[PDB]
Write a protein that binds this ligand. Structure first.
Ligand SMILES: CNC(=O)Nc1ccc(C(=O)N[C@@H]2c3cccc(O)c3C[C@@H]2C(=O)O)cc1
Length: 167
């Protein structure tokens, strides 16, 4: 039993809810919140910008030190940093950005990072300003992630479409 509330069960291990991932993280305080990161950990907009804003820019300060030490992530890769006031840990995962021409096959590799964590609160990777089809992203998620994932979908219209078209 865990504290995630009001989710629709899609599969044995994947759950979804129309929710603001920032508000959901503040209420649940999960072990892991996933950020929709880029390779530079520049959290300017979309989910990343929102999570970083909710940390009063502490996420960005920590991220800049991480990059200064380690260099950029790989598309499809991840790193674990602090969750600040939102979660114990933040798993920064880089899905491909279609608006940069990145290979959509890297989406499966990106979701594989979730399997290193037993339970996660996460957005749909490569959705939103990353330019991929969220229906496709949900399908890859369900077919790749084996650990327990609670997906927060900000847009109600998209949530309903994600739900009604789900196979
Ligand atoms: C104060 N709180 C706050 O600003 N929160 C916040 C801000 C932005 C996002 C975001 O960009 N979401 C994206 C989006 C939008 C439309 C269609 C979409 O396919 C997606 C994918 C993303 C998602 O829904 O996971 C999420 C939360």
């Amino acid at each position: 039993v865990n504290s995630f509330s009001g989710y629709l069960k899609l599969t044995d291990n994947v759950y979804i809810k129309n929710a603001d991932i920032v508000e959901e993280a503040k209420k649940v305080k999960p072990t892991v919140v996933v950020n929709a990161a880029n390779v530079y950990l520049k959290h300017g907009g979309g989910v990343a910008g929102a999570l970083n804003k909710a940390t009063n820019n502490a996420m960005q300060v920590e991220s800049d030190d991480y990059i200064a030490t380690n260099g950029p992530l790989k598309v499809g890769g991840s790193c674990v940093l602090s969750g600040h006031n939102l979660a114990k840990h933040c798993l920064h995962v880089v899905g491909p950005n279609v608006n940069k021409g990145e290979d959509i096959q890297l989406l499966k590799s990106a979701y594989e990072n979730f399997n290193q964590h037993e339970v996660l609160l996460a957005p749909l990777l490569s959705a939103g300003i990353f330019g991929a089809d969220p229906i496709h992203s949900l399908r890859v998620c369900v077919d790749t992630v084996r650990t327990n994932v609670y997906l927060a979908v900000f847009d109600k219209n998209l949530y309903d479409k994600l739900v009604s078209s789900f196979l």
